[PDB]
Design a protein around this ligand. Sequence first.
Ligand SMILES: [Cu+2]
Ligand SMILES: [N]
Length: 9
Amino acid sequence: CYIQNCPLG
Ligand SMILES: [Cu+2]
Ligand SMILES: [N]
């Protein structure tokens, strides 16, 4: 999300 590049930010 900040380093786990999550989808649909
Ligand atoms: Cu991340
Ligand atoms: N997001």
